[PDB]
Amino acid sequence: GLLNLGVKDIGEKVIFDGKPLNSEDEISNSGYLGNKLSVSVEQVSIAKPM
Amino acid sequence: SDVLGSQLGVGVQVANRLDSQYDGTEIIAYASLNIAVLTRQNTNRHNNVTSIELHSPIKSIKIPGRSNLVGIITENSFQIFRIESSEPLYFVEIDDLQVVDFAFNPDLQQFAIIDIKGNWSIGRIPIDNLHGTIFDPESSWKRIEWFSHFQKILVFDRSKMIEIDFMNNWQTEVVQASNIRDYKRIDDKNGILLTSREIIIVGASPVRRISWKHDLDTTLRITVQKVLVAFVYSMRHKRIYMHVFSHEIPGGTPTGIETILTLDHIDVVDFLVKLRNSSEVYYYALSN
Amino acid sequence: AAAAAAAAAA
Amino acid sequence: AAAAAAAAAAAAAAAA
Amino acid sequence: EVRNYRTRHIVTLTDLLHLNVSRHNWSLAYKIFATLIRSLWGIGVEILDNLSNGLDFLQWMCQIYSSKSHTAKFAITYLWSSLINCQTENDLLQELIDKISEWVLAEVWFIYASCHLLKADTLSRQFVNDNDIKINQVIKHIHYVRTFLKICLDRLIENQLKSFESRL
């Protein structure tokens, strides 16, 4: 059907909260886009009006 | 010969029951509420690979066979685990509050359960139903074993030993002064080892018996080698003794730190495992 | 004798 | 247990 | 401590019920179970199938209670009884199966896939017979086979389906 295709189109939204990487010596800590609490939707379906 | 201790398994509990896998590589120790599995093949191997949480203290574990399943007995329910890639396959719940010992039929179809009430429960593994129950013993049945022919079954209880037909009814019984903690039937046949302070070898069906004294306290457990040539018994007085078939010439005697509650022998008479009061298991390699 | 007595009681 | 026993006895009596 | 008459009676009744299951007591189960009504019910489900006097209804009621909320123990059983029992209109059952799967997303999907397969086998032999027609049923059977193939995907089974199509 249509909805499954529709959810895929707007499939992922990512919000990043800044935090120190806390790794060893590397410039990646300064660049920390960070860790991505990736979110997605793989399937949506109306069950019934029962 | 002699036995050399290869490994120690720190269960951290006392180990009431232990089994070895079959070319066995894992040993299973039953403690209190859990069954620990250790891979002996990996000599540092300090900790157990897997743990199965059955219930309260564990009286007995038995592996079928081929070696796919494991049956654990303690409280009211008996747990059957699938060790094949373990997880609980099924559970058998009986009225009796506890089970002292377990035995598997040779065609792996039946489980025999030694109940505290004294009754013997026969369970059909496939239905997980109780086909039949033999009651004789007043009190708790402590131990059991199967006749070499597999036709008969022998059990010991508090103060008596009884022989049962597979068909049903009790063939015979022996009365003793004390409690009977453990028993074994010789694989060859014609010999029954009984575990009291004394160890008595009873001739099946003759009057004559042999009595051996090498235990100071109660003999908690006994097992015959598969070969039948010799057997071992364990005692409260921390000793594991190996004896010759029938009339028990002492082959060798290990002294452990504490009481030796349980024991098992590998299917090819290579290794011996004992469970101890010291909350550990000891693994021995038998040497030619 | 004992069996007969039981029947009477019933 | 006692109660159970009593019940059993009663049942037996009834049967008789 | 224990109740005077009531606790002891319940324990004894349960013990008697266990004895009845050990030995079939169609009559004992009927009266013992009734006395016992005063979770669990597998023995009750078992007695209806073991001793008949049409054992499908009780399981459905048990499955219906405690729905709101691995997977559910009451249920995965009820589904199996259905297909075996069929072995009334099936389509309906297939519909129900889908409904359950929708609500809850051992997977039920596998069971659903198996159920269609049974219908295909019936379709396969009816189609093979002359009493002689070229499109209709053959096309329907092909569609059913493709549908069955999709569900399993998301060796023995596949082989069987193929044999079936060829015969048709």
Q: Describe it for me?
A:
- The structure is cut from a larger assembly and holds chains A (50 residues), B (288 residues), C (10 residues), D (16 residues) and E (168 residues).
- Chain A has 50 residues and is low in regular secondary structure.
- Chain A contains one helix and two strands.
- Chain A has a two-stranded antiparallel ribbon with strand order 1-2.
- Chain C is elongated, with a radius of gyration of 5 Å.
- Chain D starts with a helix and ends with a helix.
- Chain D has one helix spanning 2-15.
- Chain E is built from nine helices and no strands.
- Chain E has helices at residues 5-22, 26-37, 42-50, 57-64, 75-86, 90-103, 109-128, 136-153, 156-167.
- Classes of the chains: A little secondary structure (50), B mainly beta (288), C mainly alpha (10), D mainly alpha (16), E mainly alpha (168).
- Chains in contact: A-E, B-E, C-D, D-E.
- At the D-E interface, helix 1 of D face helix 1 of E.
- Chain E: It is found in: Nucleus, Nucleolus.
- Chain E: This is RNA polymerase I-specific transcription initiation factor RRN11.
Structure in a nutshell:
It is classed as transcription. This is part of a larger assembly, with chains A (50 residues), B (288 residues), C (10 residues), D (16 residues) and E (168 residues). Chain C is mainly alpha-helical and 10 residues long.
What attributes characterize this protein structure?
part of a larger assembly, 5 chains, C: 10 residues, mainly alpha, 1 helix, elongated, D: 16 residues, 88% helix, rod-shaped, RNA polymerase I-specific transcription initiation factor RRN6 (chain B), RNA polymerase I-specific transcription initiation factor RRN11 (chain E), DNA-directed RNA polymerase I subunit RPA135 (chain A), transcription
Strand content of chain E: under 5%
- Biggest interface between chains: D-E, 4 and 9 residues
Order of helix and strand elements from N to C terminus of chain C: H
Helix content of chain E: over 70%
Count of individual beta strands of chain E: 0
Task: Write down the Rg of chain C.
Answer: 5 Å
Largest sheet of chain C: none
Q: Please indicate the count of domains of chain E.
A: 1
Q: Largest sheet of chain E at a glance?
A: none
SSE-based structural type of chain C: mainly alpha
Helix content of chain C: over 70%
Layout of secondary structure:
This is part of a larger assembly, with chains A (50 residues), B (288 residues), C (10 residues), D (16 residues) and E (168 residues).
Chain B: E1 2-9, E2 17-20, E3 26-30, E4 35-39, E5 50-52, E6 60-62, E7 69-73, E8 77-82, E9 87-93, E10 99-104, E11 110-115, E12 120-124, E13 129-134, E14 141-146, E15 152-157, E16 160-165, E17 170-175, E18 182-185, E19 192-195, E20 199-202, E21 209-212, E22 219-224, E23 230-235, E24 240-244, E25 250-252, E26 260-265, E27 271-276, E28 280-287
Antiparallel strand pairs in B: 1-28, 2-3, 3-4, 4-5, 6-7, 7-8, 8-9, 10-11, 11-12, 12-13, 14-15, 15-16, 16-17, 18-19, 19-20, 20-21, 22-23, 23-24, 24-25, 26-27, 27-28
Chain C: H1 2-9
Chain E: H1 5-22, H2 26-37, H3 42-50, H4 57-64, H5 75-86, H6 90-103, H7 109-128, H8 136-153, H9 156-167
